[model samples]
Every structure is written in C-alpha cells, then in structure tokens.
Target: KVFGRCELAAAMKRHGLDNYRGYSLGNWVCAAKFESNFNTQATNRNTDGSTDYGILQINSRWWCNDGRTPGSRNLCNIPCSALLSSDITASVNCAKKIVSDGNGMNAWVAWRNRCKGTDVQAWIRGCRL
Candidate 1:
C-alpha cells in the first residue's frame, strides 16, 4: 500500500526507524523511496530469481521466507507477508536483525548507492515530523 510521506515519517519515528538503533534515518528514508516508492507491499524479483520484500525491500535470500527460495536462513523468522503491512514493526525488527548481524546499512544497496555521502535532509523536509 502506498503511504503518504508524512504518515510514513511519523510512523518511522514511532517505530524507532527515525534513529533506528543508530542506523541512519537518511539511509532509511532514501532506501524507502528507492526500494519501494513508499509502498509497503512493494516487491522486486532480482535477476538471481530471489525476491525482495516490503518497504525496506528485504531479500528472500536472507531475511524472510517466500517459499520459492530454499534454505532461507530467515534471521527474522517472520513470514514474508508480515513485511507487507502498514504496521512496520516486523520490518523494523527484521532490519535491525540484519544490521545487528554485522552488515550494517550495507545490507541495502539503496543505502550505499543512493544515500551515501548525499544530503538526506530534503527527504524529511516537508515531512510533518
């Protein structure tokens, strides 16, 4: 589902995604835009045939189970469906797990490719906080 920017921003703050346990809010917002265009149910099939799930576009290869990918070491243990919700608790938790596993924000190509060394202030500028 497509969410309004302000709505997503506020939700992010409430769910601890604003700071994200020391994760970059910049990366979060930038990746959200790039990966899903603010749509929670967004999914992308990689050339490798693995799928990315949800707002953060978490991958089936590691984060969640989509049934197609085998031997998915789902560290989050959450169903892929859980990520496709307006309530981002599961997605945030999963993201944290990925970061905590030592990958940091590098787990998301959108973060490294888009948000890195870029001024992310504009992403939240018109956001109603």
Candidate 2:
C-alpha cells in the first residue's frame, strides 16, 4: 500500500528516527518520495534481472533476492517482499542497519540524486513530527 507522507513521517518519528546516522527525517521522506512515492510494493527491475525493492528501493545487486535472480547477499537479512508491506518497521530497521555500514543515507541513489544537497524542509512541512 502507498502511504500518505504524514503517515510515513509519523511512523518514522514513532520509530525514533528523526535522524538515522547523519541523515535527517526530511532526507528520509524526500528519498522515499523519489524512490517509491511511499509505495511499499514498488520495485524497479534492472537490465541484469536484478530488482530494487520496497519504499527504500533496496537493491538486489547487494541487498535482497527475488527467488531466481541469483542475488545472494541479502545484506539486511530480510526478504525483499518483507519490505513490500504497509508496515514500515522491517524496512526502516533494515535501512538503518544498511546506512550504518554504507555512507549514511548517501547509500541510497535516490537520496544522492534527488534528496542530496536540497533543502528538504517542505518534504515534511506539515508533518509536524
């Protein structure tokens, strides 16, 4: 299910995720917006048959598997489909763990290409959380 921006913001705040590593809540929201538009089922298939999964667009190249794509290193240790749900718990948890290992939210291509270097205030403007 695709969630509203406010719903996502509240969920992030409830999970005590105002900032994960060096990234801000606005960055998270902005990344999600660009990556999946708040849709948990979002997936982007690569020409190599690999796919990006969930609202975070966690990639099969180094993240999860799709049962036949031969992507083996599910770094987050959760199934790709697990991220494709309305509940953001597993997705958020896995993403935070990934950021700890990578260059914070810079690991996300959406964050780098879209959210990075932008003033993301309006991304969470009315969320008030």
Candidate 3:
C-alpha cells in the first residue's frame, strides 16, 4: 500500500518515531520518502546481494533474516516478508530497533544522502500533527 505524505507522517508519529533518539519525525518522513516512497511492498536488492524490504527499507545484511541473504544476522528477529505488510507494525518495530542499535538514522543511506543536514521539515510541511 502507498501512503499519502501527511498520512505517513501521522503514522510514523503514532509508531513512536517522533523525536526517536534525537531524529525528528520529519527525518523519518524524509528518509521514508526517499527509501520507499511510503510503499509498504517496496524492495530492492543491494550490490552485496542483501535485500532491502518494506517502507523503511530494512536490510537483510544485519536486520531481518530472509534466509536468502548471504550473511543475515536477523537482529530484528522477523521475517523480511513481514515488512511488506500494510499494517506497518513490524516495519516500525524493526526501524525503532535499528535506530537504537548505534547507527541511528544513519542506518539508511537515503537519509544520509537526502534527509541528513537538509531541511527535513519540507518533508512534513503543513501536516496537522
């Protein structure tokens, strides 16, 4: 499922992403905009053969264990397919774990390239929440 811009903002906030570990909700919104465009089923294969899954693009390299990734550690303790669910609970839980795992929002390359050091408020402008 694809989410409208502000809808995703409110959803992220509902999932406890607001001010999560110093990263604002806009940062999460900006990263998700770049990572998967708010599509729940988004997936991408990395050069190392690890796969990124779901809206936040949690990776197989060190997060979810798809059982197909060459070096997956399954730190999120979830099946990668769970990330594709429209419910988004699993994805949000894994993302919270990722943030607390020392990388913070830097876990996403899209955040580093696009959201980081930029005006992330633009990603959530005019949203009522």
Candidate 4:
C-alpha cells in the first residue's frame, strides 16, 4: 500500500528527511506510486528474463547473489526492498541513500518517462537531486 501522510512523515523523520516537504515529499511519493503502487511485493518482468523485485522494482539479479534469493536480504542489505519492507525506519534510511546517490528515484523517473505513458517528470521537477 502507498504510504499515507503520517506514515510518510514518520518515515521522513526516521530518514533525516524532516526538512523535506512540498515537492520533495511529492517526488518521493510519485516514485513510490509509479514503481510499485507502494506494494512491497511488487515485481516487474525484465526483458532479460530475470525479474525486478520489490517496491522500487530493483533488479533481483543485480542486487542479490552469492547464493541468496531476492527476498533474503535484511532491510539494510537490499537497499531498495529494505525501504519497502516492514522496517519503515531502515527502509527510509536506505531510500535516502538511493535517492541521494543520483541513481535511484530520479533515474527510475527518467526511465519511466521514455518507456511509458505521459511524462511523469512534472511530478518530481522541483525535488530532484
């Protein structure tokens, strides 16, 4: 399920995102909405026949290996899924890293823009890194 305002607020606080508001929160929510409708179990079919798993639709093969399945990692281990798991605190912390890395939500937005329906870029314009 998509995070509600209070849930998001708490998550922000846990992630040191208390200063974030307006477009910042909006962008984060937009990414979460687009990626998995906020479903933690969300998964997508990749062209390579592997699957992108979890809320952020992170590629399982890319994120997990060494004899571990996609869902085995803890909140801190699987950065993207960690953000969507029951541990909202850990998830938020991990999400902040991904968002700050310049290769997470923003990159997903860019990719979604080129591949899908209308440009959702407008939804995140003011809060991008």
Candidate 5:
C-alpha cells in the first residue's frame, strides 16, 4: 500500500510511534517519506547484496533474513518478505526494535540525511491526530 501523508501518520500513531524514543510522529512520517515514499513493498538492494524492505526500509543485513544476505542477523526474527506485507505490523515492530537497539533512526541513512534535526512537523502538517 502507498499511504498518503496523513494516512501514514495515523497508521504510525496507531502502531504507537508517536513520541517514541523522543521522536515525534512527524519525525517518523518524514523518515518514511524519504525512505520508501510510503510504499509498503519498497525494496532497495545494496551493492553488498543486502536489501532494505518495507516502508521504513529495514535492512536485511542486520534486521531480517532474506535467505540471501550473507550475514543476516535476523534480529527481528522475521523473514524479509514479512516487511513487504501491507499489514505493516512486523515492519513497525522491527523499526521499534531498531530504535530500541540504540540506532536512533540513524540506522537509516536517509533519515539522517533528510529527517534528522529538521522541522519534521511539516510531514504531518495537515494530519488530524
């Protein structure tokens, strides 16, 4: 599913991302915009053969097992395919785990480059929370 900005905001809130890890819903929303453009099935393969999956672009190298990534930690204990599901439960959970592991959303370089320290409020400007 490709979520509209407000729809993605509401979904992330429903999954408890609002103010998670001291980051606002706007921050999460902004990360998703730059990571996958709100597409559930997005995937980006890296030069090393690792792949990023789902809306937040969780990586296979340390987060999921794609049966292809050479050193997959599978820390989330889920198949990489699970991240591509429109349901997004596994994806959200894994994202939380990533943050809880002290990566602080910087695990995604796109977030660091595009979302970190920005006025993220604009990402959810019209969303009625």
Candidate 6:
C-alpha cells in the first residue's frame, strides 16, 4: 500500500511545505510512491551493485563524501536529500527545486506521462506555484 494521506501531510509539515498549489506535492508523492512505495529505508542497487540511498533516492556514491569513498558527506551537502532522515518533505522540496529550476512542469509531466499517461500532463500543467 502507498503512504496514507495523513502520513504524507505530516511528512510535508515536517519539511515546512505549505505552498503546494501547483500540485507539486501530489506529483512528488505519486513519484515516490511509484518509486519506493513511500519506503524511507528503500535503497536501489546499480548494475555494478553500487547503491542509491534513502527516501529521495540520493545515490550514495554521487552525494556522500564522508571518506567512505573519494567523498562521502552528509545528505545536507546535496540540500535535496538533507531532510531525508526526517521524511518525504525533503524529497518533495528537492523535487520542487528541481522542477522550478528550469525543468518546470515538463519534468513531472514527462514522469507522469511515462509512468501514468498523457492525461497526466493536463493535471501537471493545471498546477500553479
């Protein structure tokens, strides 16, 4: 099952997200739900057996720099996954930044199109900041 609405709402609050008019939060929740079923402990392995860690799915090798490898700092270094330890809020904020950074609704639109359907574009485009 997916994360409940209350759980998602709490997660959103934990990350200081109150401006979800664009349905960005909903889109993010859908993405994460599809990606990991809202599993914070979720981790994915590359073909080389390397790992992408946490709820936002930050890649350990790409983001960490704590001497675990060439660089392995805390998730805060990426800003996107900084609140990963907290809940989905971090991931949502990260997605919002990414989408707002130029990718715009296209990123989420593409994601929804590919994963769900073209009709999702209408929903995504309908979202306002």
Best by TM-score: 5
Rank ordering of all candidates by lDDT, starting from the highest: 3, 5, 2, 1, 4, 6
lDDT tens readout by residue for model 5, 32-70? 999999999999999999999999999999999999998
The TM-scores, one per candidate, come to: 0.91, 0.91, 0.96, 0.53, 0.96, 0.52
Better of 1 and 6 by lDDT: 1
Between candidates 5 and 6, name the one with more favorable TM-score: 5
| Residue range with the least summed lDDT across 10 consecutive positions in model 3 | 101-110
Model 6 score (lDDT): 0.49
Q: Model 1, 87: alpha-carbon shift in Å?
A: 1.6
TM-score of 5: 0.96
Which lDDT values do the candidates have, in the order given? 0.82, 0.83, 0.92, 0.50, 0.92, 0.49
Clash pairs for candidate 1: none
Tens digits of per-residue lDDT for model 3 on 29-100?
999999999999999999999999999999999999888898789998999999999988899999999999
Angstrom error of the Cα, residue 54, model 4: value is: 2.9
> Candidate 4's residue-wise lDDT over 1-129, tens digit each?
456544544454456654342224445555566667666667676666545555556554445322344443432365444534654555455555545654545446633564234454554344423
Question: Regarding lDDT, does 1 or 3 come out ahead?
Answer: 3
User: Model 2, range 1-129, lDDT digits (tens) per residue?
Assistant: 888998888888787677878678888888899999999999989788888889888887677766756746887777789889888887888788878885888888778888889998778897766
> Who is ahead in lDDT, 5 or 6?
5
Per-residue lDDT tens digits for candidate 6, residues 48-120, read 5445555545544545332343344443355423434544545555555545555554444434554443342
